[PDB]
Design a protein around this nucleic acid. Structure first.
Ligand SMILES: [K+]
Ligand SMILES: [K+]
Ligand SMILES: [K+]
Ligand SMILES: [K+]
Ligand SMILES: [K+]
Ligand SMILES: [K+]
Ligand SMILES: [Mg+2]
Ligand SMILES: [Mg+2]
Ligand SMILES: [Mg+2]
Ligand SMILES: [Mg+2]
Ligand SMILES: [Mg+2]
Ligand SMILES: [Mg+2]
Ligand SMILES: [Mg+2]
Ligand SMILES: [Mg+2]
Ligand SMILES: [Mg+2]
Ligand SMILES: [Mg+2]
Ligand SMILES: [Mg+2]
Ligand SMILES: [Mg+2]
Ligand SMILES: [Mg+2]
Ligand SMILES: [Mg+2]
Ligand SMILES: [Mg+2]
Ligand SMILES: [Mg+2]
Ligand SMILES: [Mg+2]
Ligand SMILES: [Mg+2]
Ligand SMILES: [Mg+2]
Ligand SMILES: [Mg+2]
Ligand SMILES: [Mg+2]
Ligand SMILES: [Mg+2]
Ligand SMILES: [Mg+2]
Ligand SMILES: [Mg+2]
Ligand SMILES: [Mg+2]
Ligand SMILES: [Mg+2]
Ligand SMILES: [Mg+2]
Ligand SMILES: [Mg+2]
Lengths: 48, 177, 48, 46, 163, 44
RNA sequence: UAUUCUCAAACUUUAAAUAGGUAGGACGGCGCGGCUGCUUUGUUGAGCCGCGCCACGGAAUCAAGAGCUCCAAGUGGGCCAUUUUUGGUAAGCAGAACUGGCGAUGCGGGAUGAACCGGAAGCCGGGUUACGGUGCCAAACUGCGCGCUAACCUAGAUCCCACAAAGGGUGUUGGUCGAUUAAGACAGCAGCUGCCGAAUCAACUAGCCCCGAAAAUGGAUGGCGCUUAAGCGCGCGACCUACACCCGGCCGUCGGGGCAAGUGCCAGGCCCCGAUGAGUAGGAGGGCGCGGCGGUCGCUGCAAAACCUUGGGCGCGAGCCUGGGCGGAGCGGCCGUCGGUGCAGAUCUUGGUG
């Protein structure tokens, strides 16, 4: 994994389609920062 | 179909240790907007009520609870604790809704309106389906009438869709109850 | 081969959860091995 | 009068630089009695 | 000098521990120090000779010289953008043998034998340690569930032991 | 379109339904609220 | 003697969080020998040396790489903010600690603002966002929902932020505890009591509103206005909006690669690939322009220089080329080399002119 992952250049994603809620607050508080577990996939769709 | 707030049962325990290979298993019924936030609030109470932090705890099961009969009307009582600008208080509220999710949504909306209490300053102690004869609030009793009857005093005038919206009209709205 | 493995793992997890339910116990899912991290704040005013 | 503001930032521009470490270190400041015998031991080494 | 003496601000650092004053136990004087060993500098307040400057208290260094009553110690010191290798001599009463490398020697031997055993069987392996990884899935037998709920508030309990 | 018409034994299906139904009962189970002796009347 | 209320920057048994030091191999390990004037009762130690053998790199992640030297500029008035913090009643006051920011820096938002929020930038097209917004000013809903408020004080209206307190209200909305009531309460009526036939009384609590609340040019939620809010609290959907992010084009910079029995080249060149672009003080590179000198290639009475032009074109730019006019005798390109070599400022100098 170390070699395979390092081989990948960091992904240059676009601004999320639909925007963010609040980057200044944690996802638990209703914001966008921190661990969102399986909900990262929903964000990946809108940013890829 | 879609609810702002969802009810979950969260089950967790402290990590097994040599002294206790089978630590007690704790369950809670928590309200949150999704699973991730339900888990976070579960560890908040376990940390402060059972002295079990997430770093030394284990998440076992998380399941969402759905209303059994979402087509009928039930009376819901909610016992809650909230923080005001000067301290903490306990209050009991009643609501009428087809699902307890809607009743909990009403509770949060009412607390914000009548008391300026934000969501994070509320702890739900108990919820239950109250039979009509055991209700206490008059806002709920007055609708316990087999012959419920009243007119629509206030109506919202608007086209069915904005497609039929025009700035100018030849005559004023004709309204009657 | 990889496609078959992915489907088997998905069905394997479902079977285990159902098996625990039937016996009245709990099945703790394996902890996530992979994370995807996205930067949501800019490069201004960065603590060291 | 005095302030350490910005001084850590200046230090980290090119630092923190660790000194170059060589396999053999200088013997200056060590016990002369030990050093003198070591010189004789190498002299007669064969 | 220049506004501060040698032992300024050492009221607590150089004071002896509570109920641990008086005679120094003789295991301190029976320690053996060799070149290359690691030692932690801990100033003993009773011994006023060969005592290091307060900066070196609580620092770990490498032994580079041995004398009759003292050991030369190399201590890193950060001055602006550089690290300096400060060489100081300290009486053995102020130094303790450090256990920072206690796991190294034993680890090397275990790695050597594991590679030797794997070499004979032609199986390439790695002896590197790894940090704690994610746990695998498992089943937990059902048991009695204790329900936890928020507690109703009581003002009388907002004080240690109550009002 | 053709309205064309089981993978579990009949006995197994009954056990599955019972286990899930029992699990749901624990999900909606409530505390007895007995440890709150000062708020027994308020909690009902 | 046993208890008890309340305390300490210059008290303390105990004692965090954050931060600080060291270590995680090839400069490792083992075996057999050797050297010594040091060391030991002792080839006992200590360090070093020679030979032989072993050593999958000995936690994670990253590594637009690492080390070393020389010469030298500028600077050595700082200021702001979260937090910790000293003096002071306090200060847009004075002085420290860690980090960031401004200064040196535009750009979007905060009406307006060096420091707040977002975010840092080559020249463009498209897409999407951040903060902030979607009644008009003004790009985007008078969008879909619940409640609260009614201000006869200029009701209220968004971090920094441009203020308001103690204390009060039978204003109104929620909640908490207690008391009373179909065996008849409460108000009134009647002579403790009868008529009376449905709820009533008291305290506390906290939302919004109101009182408390006085200043000098006329004026400021930014303005207009807004009350089935366009106010306040909490939601939902969509939408608007940066020089930020994504895709594409082009310019520069940095790094990488290809090109000779040369059909072979301003190789100081051509071609291909990847990343990247803020800048005061300051440094450096490549270029533009002026006047000579050594050379070289030219122009000119069939019209040189200078000057004029609503002519045209080239270069990111310093500048350059050219049409027409005026003028009437000199001038230019290129290589090298040289210098009294480039102006908007100096209450600059002289002259001229409003
Ligand atoms: K002093
Ligand atoms: K200087
Ligand atoms: K009130
Ligand atoms: K010439
Ligand atoms: K011209
Ligand atoms: K020249
Ligand atoms: Mg990128
Ligand atoms: Mg869109
Ligand atoms: Mg936003
Ligand atoms: Mg911030
Ligand atoms: Mg910021
Ligand atoms: Mg002096
Ligand atoms: Mg000093
Ligand atoms: Mg100066
Ligand atoms: Mg100064
Ligand atoms: Mg000053
Ligand atoms: Mg300046
Ligand atoms: Mg403003
Ligand atoms: Mg654009
Ligand atoms: Mg509206
Ligand atoms: Mg008040
Ligand atoms: Mg405004
Ligand atoms: Mg591009
Ligand atoms: Mg630049
Ligand atoms: Mg010339
Ligand atoms: Mg003109
Ligand atoms: Mg020229
Ligand atoms: Mg001259
Ligand atoms: Mg001059
Ligand atoms: Mg001039
Ligand atoms: Mg000038
Ligand atoms: Mg003048
Ligand atoms: Mg003049
Ligand atoms: Mg004049």
């Amino acid at each position: 994994f170390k070699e395979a992952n390092n081989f990948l250049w960091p992904f240059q994603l676009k601004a999320p389609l639909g925007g963010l809620k609040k980057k200044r607050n944690h996802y638990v508080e209703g914001g966008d920062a921190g661990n969102r577990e399986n909900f990262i996939n929903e964000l990946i769709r809108r940013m890829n | 179909v879609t609810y702002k707030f969802h009810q979950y049962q969260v089950v967790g325990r402290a990590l097994p240790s040599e002294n206790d290979e089978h630590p007690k298993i704790y369950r809670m019924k928590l309200w949150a907007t999704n699973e991730v936030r339900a888990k976070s609030k579960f560890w908040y109470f376990l940390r402060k009520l059972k002295k079990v932090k997430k770093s030394n705890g284990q998440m076992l099961a998380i399941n969402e609870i759905f209303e059994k009969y979402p087509t009928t009307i039930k009376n819901y009582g909610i016992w809650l604790r909230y923080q005001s600008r000067t301290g903490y208080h306990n209050m009991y509220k009643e609501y009428r809704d087809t699902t307890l999710n809607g009743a909990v949504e009403q509770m949060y909306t009412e607390m914000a309106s009548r008391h300026r209490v934000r969501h994070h300053c509320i702890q739900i102690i108990k919820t239950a389906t109250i039979p009509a004869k055991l209700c206490k609030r008059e806002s709920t009793k007055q609708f316990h009438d087999s012959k419920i009857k009243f007119p629509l005093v206030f109506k919202k005038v608007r086209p069915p869709s904005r497609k039929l919206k025009t700035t100018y009209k030849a005559t004023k709205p004709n309204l009657f109850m | 081969q990889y496609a078959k493995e992915y489907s088997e793992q998905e069905k394997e997890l479902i079977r285990l959860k159902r098996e625990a339910r039937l016996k009245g116990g709990f099945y703790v899912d394996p902890e996530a091995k992979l994370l995807f991290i996205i930067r949501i704040r800019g490069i201004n005013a960065m603590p060291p | 009068n005095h302030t350490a503001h910005n001084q850590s930032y200046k230090a980290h521009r090119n630092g923190i630089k660790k000194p170059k470490s060589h396999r053999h270190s200088s013997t200056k400041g060590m016990d002369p009695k030990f050093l003198r015998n070591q010189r004789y031991a190498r002299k007669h080494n064969k | 000098p220049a506004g501060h003496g040698l032992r300024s601000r050492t009221r607590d650092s150089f004071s002896r521990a509570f109920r641990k004053k008086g005679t120094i136990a003789l295991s301190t004087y029976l320690r053996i120090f060799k070149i290359g060993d690691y030692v932690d500098i801990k100033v003993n307040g009773a011994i006023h000779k060969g005592m290091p400057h307060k900066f070196y208290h609580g620092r770990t260094g490498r032994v580079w010289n041995v004398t009759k009553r003292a050991v030369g110690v190399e201590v890193n010191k950060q001055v602006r953008n550089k690290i300096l290798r400060k060489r100081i001599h300290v009486r053995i009463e102020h130094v303790q043998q450090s256990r920072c490398t206690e796991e190294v020697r034993e680890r090397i031997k275990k790695n050597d034998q594991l590679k030797a055993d794997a070499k004979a069987r032609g199986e390439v392996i790695s002896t590197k340690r790894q940090p704690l990884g994610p746990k695998p899935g498992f089943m937990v037998e059902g048991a009695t569930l204790e329900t936890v709920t928020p507690i109703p508030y009581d003002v009388v309990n907002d004080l240690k032991g109550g009002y | 379109k053709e309205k064309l018409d089981h993978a579990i034994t009949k006995e197994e299906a009954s056990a599955i339904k019972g286990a899930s139904h029992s699990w749901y009962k624990t999900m909606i189970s409530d505390s007895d609220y007995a440890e709150f002796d000062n708020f027994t009347k308020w909690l009902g």
